[PDB]
């Protein structure tokens, strides 16, 4: 209880910061995923051809419903 509660606090601070730091990186990858799909299409008006591609958004928001459904208690 001092070699056990000094871990399920020291390894719970480590997880709960991490999720918050990953959540931040999940947002930033949405930006880039979209920012790119834009800049890519903005090429047709310059280049031989243009890469016919999509963004899977239902996915970016599916695992963003998670992380926000898992942040309950520590």
């Amino acid at each position: 209880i001092e070699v056990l509660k000094r871990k399920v606090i020291e390894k719970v601070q480590h997880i709960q910061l991490l999720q918050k730091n990953v959540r931040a990186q999940l947002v930033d990858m949405k930006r880039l995923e979209v920012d790119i799909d834009i800049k890519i299409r903005s090429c047709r008006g310059s280049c031989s051809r243009a890469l016919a591609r999509e963004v899977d958004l239902k996915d970016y928001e599916d695992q963003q419903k998670q992380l926000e459904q898992v942040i309950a208690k520590d």
Binding site: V8, K30, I40, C43, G45, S48, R53, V55, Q63, V70
Partner: protein, 312 residues
Amino acid sequence: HQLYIDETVNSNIPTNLRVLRSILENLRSKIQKLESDVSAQMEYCRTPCTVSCNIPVVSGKECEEIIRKGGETSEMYLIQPDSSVKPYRVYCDMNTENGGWTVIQNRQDGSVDFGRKWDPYKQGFGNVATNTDGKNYCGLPGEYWLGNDKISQLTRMGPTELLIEMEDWKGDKVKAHYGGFTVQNEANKYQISVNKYRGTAGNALMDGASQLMGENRTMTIHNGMFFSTYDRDNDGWLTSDPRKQCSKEDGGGWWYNRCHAANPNGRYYWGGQYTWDMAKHGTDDGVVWMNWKGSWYSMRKMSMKIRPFFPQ
């Protein structure tokens, strides 16, 4: 009180590692795709796209003179408003209401980058038109912005009216007529000014956001406001912090108050609806016309056409 022993806080911490790892490795395999792509295009972009834009014989000074000169189908005609002013290409709409429309800004497929500096907004950018099926005249319009140097002089010739058309991603269209339109020069920082609104879109240049009120509706008015690009800022913010800029990197050039009720030179968001996390800056930077769709909707199409005003 030593029921203070939790086994379940080491029998559901596996759970915070199923989800938390799935996520991290989904994004490693998302950076996977967005690597191949930005490198496949990079390859395509070793050689340019090409057009054969055969000119029609019938010139003019603007696109009315030309329809009155018998040039009677929509395509790209070469024009010249002034004898000292070297002539330039342009697309002319000879089908909307009664033709004569000189097109100045068009959006339809996000095929041109609009987030550009101050200089290439003054000059202009984009493709004016392009070839089509079994023909040799460019009978279809490109995405482009005619230019500030160009649209200034083209309006300071007399009585210049202005049409604004747009489409949502469901197939609905709305017009935004402005019977008067003026744009000053560079020394006067291309200051807009408009009157005589009518249409199904909603006056958003003089009135502002039709969902903001009083002081809030006051600061969403482009009318009389200057023109600003991400590298030259002349917006309504006299809070001197470059943190309070209307036009931030990768954002369009436009007549920015504090900041906007609409922005046709915004970024082209596929699908229509976009959100906080999608926008490179959190801002509402897309192709927005608030008075019709809201603040987080970017338009499928968005044209800007002009014509002189003879007492109709």
